[PDB]
């Protein structure tokens, strides 16, 4: 397993180099069917890139095929959310779904029951801004989500999770933080994952509500990921 033999600097560079591209939404006031239409198309395309990104996460390739499936099925919405939150960081009060799709919570109300998650998403972004979350920390958290979210449903996964913790502390040691400041912010970072988990679960509930209402015929891939949560 090469993931464990990597220095934390190599781990950082490896994660950075695996970062998926920022996709665009299709171009051109929204209803609830049109807004959901854009988001569904975008989310489905982001999924494809995420799955290929996961194969480039150090140690994920070492897992068996259906263990990779389990972790991706459990954490796909979390990963999509923390991604949305990260690129929306420099746009306070707004969520940057795409460079040509920047929305505020007032526009989030067009879709029923979406405004709750938006505020939670916006609150997560404001927290990242407050902590001045760095890109190297973000990619560490995202891969942590990928490995941790479904691991409790294994030693090698905990093996890799420890090295990312070492990678995090290493990064924060580079930024001139004292020992105390290092496990404090480390704790702060990891506690965010509890909220992201909460958003995902409430987000999962909202999409299943959109399936049984059938306004947008969800993607078969998106349906497979959604039906996986039961």
């Amino acid at each position: 397993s090469l993931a464990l033999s990597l220095t934390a600097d190599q781990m950082v560079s490896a994660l950075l180099d695996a970062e998926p591209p920022i996709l665009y939404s299709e171009y051109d006031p929204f209803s609830e069917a049109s807004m959901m239409g854009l988001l569904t198309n975008l989310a489905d395309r982001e999924l494809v890139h995420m799955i290929n990104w996961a194969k480039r996460v150090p140690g994920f390739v070492d897992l068996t095929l259906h263990d990779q499936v389990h972790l991706l099925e459990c954490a796909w919405l979390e990963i999509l959310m923390i991604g949305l939150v990260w690129r929306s960081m420099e746009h306070p009060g707004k969520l940057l779904f795409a460079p040509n799709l920047l929305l505020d919570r007032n526009q989030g109300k067009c879709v029923e029951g979406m405004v709750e998650i938006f505020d939670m998403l916006l609150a997560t972004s404001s927290r990242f801004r407050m902590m001045n979350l760095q890109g190297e920390e973000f990619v560490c958290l995202k891969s942590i989500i990928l490995l941790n979210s479904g691991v409790y449903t294994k030693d090698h996964i905990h093996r890799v999770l420890d090295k990312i913790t070492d990678t995090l502390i290493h990064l924060m040691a580079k930024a001139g933080l004292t020992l105390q400041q290092q496990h404090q912010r480390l704790a702060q970072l990891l506690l965010i994952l509890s909220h992201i988990r909460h958003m995902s679960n409430k987000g999962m509930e909202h999409l299943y509500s959109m399936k049984c209402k059938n306004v947008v015929p969800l993607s078969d891939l998106l349906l497979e990921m959604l039906d996986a949560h039961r």
Binding site: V48, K55, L65, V69, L221, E224
Partner: peptide, 9 residues
Amino acid sequence: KILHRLLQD
């Protein structure tokens, strides 16, 4: 499933 095919290529 679709996830299968995407993880194999």
